[PDB]
Design a protein around this ligand. Structure first.
Ligand SMILES: CC(=O)N[C@H]1[C@H]([C@H](O)[C@H](O)CO)O[C@@](OC[C@H]2O[C@@H](O)[C@H](O)[C@@H](O)[C@H]2O)(C(=O)O)C[C@@H]1O
Ligand SMILES: CC(=O)N[C@H]1[C@H]([C@H](O)[C@H](O)CO)O[C@@](OC[C@H]2O[C@@H](O)[C@H](O)[C@@H](O)[C@H]2O)(C(=O)O)C[C@@H]1O
Ligand SMILES: CC(=O)N[C@H]1[C@H]([C@H](O)[C@H](O)CO)O[C@@](OC[C@H]2O[C@@H](O)[C@H](O)[C@@H](O)[C@H]2O)(C(=O)O)C[C@@H]1O
Ligand SMILES: *[C@H]1O[C@H](CO)[C@@H](O[C@H]2O[C@H](CO)[C@@H](O)[C@H](O)[C@H]2NC(C)=O)[C@H](O)[C@H]1NC(C)=O
Ligand SMILES: *[C@H]1O[C@H](CO)[C@@H](O[C@H]2O[C@H](CO)[C@@H](O)[C@H](O)[C@H]2NC(C)=O)[C@H](O)[C@H]1NC(C)=O
Ligand SMILES: *[C@H]1O[C@H](CO)[C@@H](O[C@H]2O[C@H](CO)[C@@H](O)[C@H](O)[C@H]2NC(C)=O)[C@H](O)[C@H]1NC(C)=O
Ligand SMILES: *[C@@H]1O[C@H](CO)[C@@H](O)[C@H](O)[C@H]1NC(C)=O
Ligand SMILES: *[C@@H]1O[C@H](CO)[C@@H](O)[C@H](O)[C@H]1NC(C)=O
Ligand SMILES: *[C@@H]1O[C@H](CO)[C@@H](O)[C@H](O)[C@H]1NC(C)=O
Ligand SMILES: *[C@@H]1O[C@H](CO)[C@@H](O)[C@H](O)[C@H]1NC(C)=O
Ligand SMILES: *[C@@H]1O[C@H](CO)[C@@H](O)[C@H](O)[C@H]1NC(C)=O
Ligand SMILES: *[C@@H]1O[C@H](CO)[C@@H](O)[C@H](O)[C@H]1NC(C)=O
Lengths: 324, 160, 324, 160, 160, 324
């Protein structure tokens, strides 16, 4: 009669590493590292993202004739750009504080596009029907951004304009506008007459003024002239005032929005589905349970700390030593 | 192991013991079999279980968007952003890595310790009523039927 | 005769958590987490802070007619703002590099306010007595900042001015000044004549020039015109030179100071007392002994690392198992 | 415990032992009482004491003002500042948290180990001059007066 | 030590044992000498060796230029850069520091454990064929020549 | 006959610290902290650095008459400045985005200096031989930067200029140039006539225009006038266009380069040798094996984490307890 005290053993081949030994085969282990992903761009906290596809952020907001499909955009928890997001500022120029805008619009609760300054009867005694370019072509035809209005000149006189808008939307209002800079002083007159024009925007929280910086410069996608894009978030009850003697690409449409916190812009060609997630990455949504992940450094949400590890397996059982 | 039992003086595991981590295997004239010590096994479970959760539960993370976007004239702050990312991504790597290597050693030691304590739990009860055969086995000097083998298991073995 | 070896036990109910068990009652423990605070804004390293109360940083430095009490300010290790720090730039405008100034003036060894350009005989043949506004009202009366001087126009002529100051104070000198921007060109002349005026500041380490950016804009606390505030730290031996044909809110008083390192601006309605501390927070001073604290993320001094923990109790004694 | 003594084969603590952490309790014909083993208790103190200090002393911190202040056009660097704050405030949380959970387990094990070593210190001296009653107690086969009980305590017990 | 052997019941080290960490010293009528237990010593080496590498190998670092350079109007982001540097340079300090203090305790315990297991390895083989002299020594009740002393070393000691 | 099991001991005096004890003498230890350095500035990954010595970055790039030796500079993995790098913008002014340039040029694969706009016949009907100053003296003689050309005025007429350069170098091209700002309007005419001059640079990725900001300001190393330096990285195939009616310190030489990643600028008076290293610091190269170092916070390369520690010794052997 004998009794022996011993320990469990099985067919497990899981192996963990220890301070003293490498690849110790153990009976039961647990993985603390996430290295999978549904390879899908999902909803983040129950709110789908905003797809831009061919269009990029600048294109979408400015109203590029190729982003007509994003003119109804609403909700969205984070923005998605693709390896095809090349349709933006069809008309050469600098998008002032662009990165800053992209970041601030990362997440939006409500977003409504409205006519802040309607084309029809807003700029009477001003040419509001020639403001078209071939750089921004819509189906062969020469067009222009859908949210900005290129105010030309009526006949042979371009009078001083002045319009105001008071945000009574009960939420911030994103006002976008541009200043145009001709390649010369010859074009500066044939369009805005006053070869000494100026543009000025005034808010209780704004005042930068502008003057056409006519200079000789190369041509980009056609034009030698340049259009700098500007934006501003008009607070409730505040009043933005525009006035110019020329070179103003006046705001036509503006967006009334409600920003919550702030996510980011995932850029990936991965499919988009109705799946949900707490952590989203370029390659796909990740699981937010394990304390570490090696799927991608750039993530959005409540995510597992990114690590260069490939294996973080934790022993739960004991050394596995079978054989009979 | 640190406590000398696992792959130590009890050099192998029982593939036959299927209902627990640490246990017994008796052989008397009436039969033989494996029986996991329930109390010490459950406790080990509870503990290891609670250990894992800690390592996972204690990981606090808030909503964040790592990516940044800087133009060609913001290299410095862009590289600063890099330093932060690489920075934290060096801390967690080294940490997660060592956290595992260390807690793994610990877990294994824990199991060893549990086997040793069990062995010594019995070794205590039997005393001179059995010879130790340096392999985790005890051979009673007397006849030990199933009730007897039971008594030693549920820790109520008689006058030794 | 028997001897037993055993271990201590007592009436302790302190409980710690272990990797394997939660709430293990132990005989003696130690707390490694700080969660208390005297709820007082104390001196930081033996140097009291600077209270602004109703006034905010801009108000204090510019000389808002409501910050008359801070005109003697001296020493201070960190600045305190309140939920009532609303008295600042009484006259609408942008405070260029404000955050930057707030930060750089966080800590100051010595601070002396002196008349850099005295009102009386400095701007002769220039109106230096009309530079008052209702936006900056002092006891019903229309007033203006106490450290800046609003140079108007004498009669019907505003000649080109030019003053210099060479910092022979033996320490940096904070020079503050403003450029005024009328809502039109009508006001631009009735005050500075030259409807083409300009302002220019020159230091061996400065040169930005200015021009009135007259534009139509809303009115803030009265005025439709805007005043941008500028500052600069004039190094020892350097000479700052001002000159303008109008629109210069000339410096009247400037501060000669000695900056040490750099703390910050605590903003809290907590009382201020003669207590000392090595770590200060919005809710109160904290103790700088334990390695961790959860009193407040925003702290100033040599502080305990902030953590989301609520309990970090360390065992020192052993498992407590009494009963007899 | 890891070393089987605390809440193990010595399932309870002595509320009566008030002058130390680990000790003795004898019962001879002349009287009875609790006496802490001074040497092992002091040492434990010195050690635990030194341990705490380490965890506190090793925390280096320089003068810093966490807060920053960024205007509406510096969201990116403001969010970067956030990332740093949240960042470090995730490291220290997870770390402080696990540092305690782990060192706590360690401290308790340490105590257990100390009790076991003491028990075995005595177990060694007595040898066959006392029967072990699996509860941390030894019953001498001979009469052991106070001088005797003393000898075992100050580790100078005679011919066993 | 945690395992009671080092500077414990075997209060001193052998300056004479020069070919290993843990070993034997016999004294029979034929001579005497120190002999390191090769198996347990090598293993300790392999382990400690592997431990050191881990602490070094697991330290991942990418190409980086810490320095930044900010003009007099970039104090905020400059101080932010400071916060990052001081920040990480507080994490690694506290960590490296405790990593060592802790792994050091661990290493020493490891050695102690190894000595105890060796002692108990022998203690097992000899059984009643030798009296334990509470100092890591065993005195055989019988004559033990070099072949015999060998048998106990290479763990093949006869009928005890 | 007796057998005793024991442990090793030797003459070691190495001491480590443990959670429970300080200065435990142990038989064998290992150091995990690096505190040595060859006190030499070495090659970083097999590529020597660039020494500037007396000259600083601005001096080197602009062509200060004292950096004639750096006119052949090539390769370099990181830049070295000395406690003597005081020879830079010999002619007072601001180096726009200087820190940014220093950082971006930290590391360079290939670097070739070429004449983008040759002095001889490039600016005919313009004085290109008077553009000298005493502020930039070369051996007693009045000189000027070697990579920029100070275009004066021919006779009594300064016509509108306009030159372009299309980068066909097959790699980025660093174009440097300056705008000059006279102390008055008197000097503004005697040099560029047109007291209303302007300068304009145009690239497909550039457009900032300039105007002389003539203002009264102190004099630095002689001049009261100021020259602001500007740069830009001209992408392949792009065309930069310059044109001005005056105040243009036209580019004379430009650099065609290939940037890899980005290192930094070590500033130290330490000798430079042909040694190699993976981690470089101001005091000298460090070894990149141990996980920690306390030689210097500011390092370049793949380095050991910097720590305030002085001793991080790890036990490998056991407690050392000799004596016989
Ligand atoms: C103002 C207007 O009606 N838009 C024009 C546009 C503008 O003249 C231009 O964008 C101003 O910067 O020019 C369009 O033709 C482009 C045409 O312009 C010549 O001057 C140039 O020499 C040619 O090479 C060519 O680019 C345009 O489509 O952009 C016509 C458009 O109606
Ligand atoms: C220059 C001077 O003497 N200060 C005036 C001040 C200035 O005219 C104003 O700050 C310039 O921007 O105007 C004061 O009256 C304000 C008054 O101005 C009218 O033009 C406007 O239409 C009214 O609505 C009203 O705001 C002032 O107190 O600001 C008088 C002050 O003396
Ligand atoms: C344009 C030219 O030929 N360079 C001049 C230089 C320029 O006039 C100056 O850099 C423009 O800002 O002036 C030099 O003489 C300096 C001389 O100028 C007087 O106007 C001033 O009053 C004196 O104090 C003194 O600085 C120069 O060397 O800088 C001559 C140089 O040829
Ligand atoms: C938006 O992006 C597309 C894709 O780059 C622009 O078209 C480009 O690529 C097309 C290839 O199918 C070609 O049409 C051209 O290479 C190029 N565009 C030109 C010059 O025609 C497209 O023009 C953009 N949309 C607009 C007009 O804004
Ligand atoms: C400084 O701040 C105060 C407090 O906001 C200013 O007064 C405001 O609040 C007062 C309520 O008691 C009212 O007077 C007004 O709502 C408002 N100010 C106005 C328009 O009168 C105060 O004016 C500021 N001081 C100055 C003049 O700079
Ligand atoms: C570059 O730096 C040197 C060193 O500062 C300049 O010379 C300075 O120091 C010299 C001392 O030997 C003296 O010449 C002067 O103190 C000072 N320069 C002057 C005003 O002469 C040197 O001029 C600089 N080189 C140039 C001309 O750019
Ligand atoms: C391993 O054993 C399990 C029983 O626990 C069985 O279900 C499984 O199929 C086996 N697989 C292997 C590894 O052979
Ligand atoms: C474990 O051994 C090595 C690590 O030393 C590892 O590369 C391999 O994947 C493992 N081999 C197996 C099957 O155990
Ligand atoms: C606990 O015991 C201590 C003696 O150490 C005594 O002073 C205290 O009043 C007691 N309090 C409790 C918890 O009953
Ligand atoms: C310990 O138990 C739980 C944690 O499991 C905790 O919520 C509670 O505060 C503690 N209870 C007591 C009094 O021990
Ligand atoms: C220490 O001992 C070694 C032998 O291992 C010997 O080589 C060395 O010279 C000795 N030095 C000391 C510390 O006396
Ligand atoms: C160890 O003791 C102290 C630390 O307590 C230390 O200052 C000293 O350098 C060491 N002394 C020696 C020689 O062991």
């Amino acid at each position: 009669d004998t009794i022996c005290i011993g320990y469990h053993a099985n067919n497990s081949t899981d192996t963990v590493d220890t301070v003293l030994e490498k690849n110790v085969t153990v009976t039961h282990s647990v993985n603390l590292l996430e290295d999978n992903h549904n390879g899908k761009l999902c909803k983040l906290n129950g709110i789908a993202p905003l797809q831009l596809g061919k269009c990029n952020v600048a294109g979408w907001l400015l109203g590029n004739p190729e982003c007509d499909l994003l003119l109804t955009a609403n909700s969205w928890s984070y923005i998605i750009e693709t390896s095809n997001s090349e349709n933006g500022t069809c008309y050469p120029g600098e998008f002032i504080d662009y990165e800053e805008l992209r970041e601030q619009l990362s997440s939006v609760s409500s977003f409504e596009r409205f006519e802040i300054f309607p084309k029809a009867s807003s700029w009477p005694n001003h040419e509001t029907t020639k403001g078209v370019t071939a750089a921004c072509s819509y189906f062969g035809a020469s067009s222009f951004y859908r949210n900005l209005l290129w105010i030309t000149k009526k006949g042979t006189s371009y009078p001083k304009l002045s319009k105001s808008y008071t945000n009574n939307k009960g939420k911030e209002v994103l006002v976008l506008w541009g200043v145009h800079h001709p390649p010369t002083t010859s074009e500066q007159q044939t369009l805005y007459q006053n070869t000494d024009a100026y543009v000025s925007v005034g808010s209780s929280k704004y005042n930068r003024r502008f003057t056409p910086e006519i200079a000789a410069r190369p041509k980009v996608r056609g034009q030698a002239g340049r259009m700098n894009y500007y934006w501003t978030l008009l607070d409730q009850g505040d009043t933005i005032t525009f006035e110019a003697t020329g070179n103003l690409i006046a705001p036509w449409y503006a967006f009334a929005l409600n920003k919550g916190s702030d996510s980011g812009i995932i850029t990936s060609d991965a499919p988009v589905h109705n799946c949900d997630t707490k952590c989203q990455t370029p390659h796909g949504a990740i699981n937010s349970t394990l304390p570490f992940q090696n799927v991608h450094p750039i993530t959005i949400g409540e995510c597992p700390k990114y690590v260069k590890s490939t294996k973080l397996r934790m022993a739960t059982g004991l050394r596995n030593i079978p054989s009979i | 192991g640190l406590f000398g039992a696992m792959a130590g003086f009890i050099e192998g595991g029982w593939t036959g013991m299927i209902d627990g981590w640490y246990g017994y295997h008796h052989q008397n004239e009436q039969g033989s079999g494996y029986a996991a010590d329930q109390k010490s096994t459950q406790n080990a479970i509870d503990g290891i279980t609670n250990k894992v959760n800690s390592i996972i539960e204690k990981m606090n993370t808030q909503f964040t968007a790592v990516g940044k976007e800087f133009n060609n004239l913001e290299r410095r702050i862009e590289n600063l952003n890099k330093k932060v990312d690489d920075g934290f991504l060096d801390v967690w790597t080294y940490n997660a890595e060592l956290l595992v290597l260390l807690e793994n050693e610990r877990t294994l030691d824990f199991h060893d310790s549990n086997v040793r304590n069990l062995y010594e739990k019995v070794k205590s009860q039997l005393r001179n009523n059995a010879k130790e055969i340096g392999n985790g086995c005890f051979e009673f000097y007397h006849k030990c039927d199933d009730e007897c083998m039971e008594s030693v298991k549920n820790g109520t073995y008689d006058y030794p």
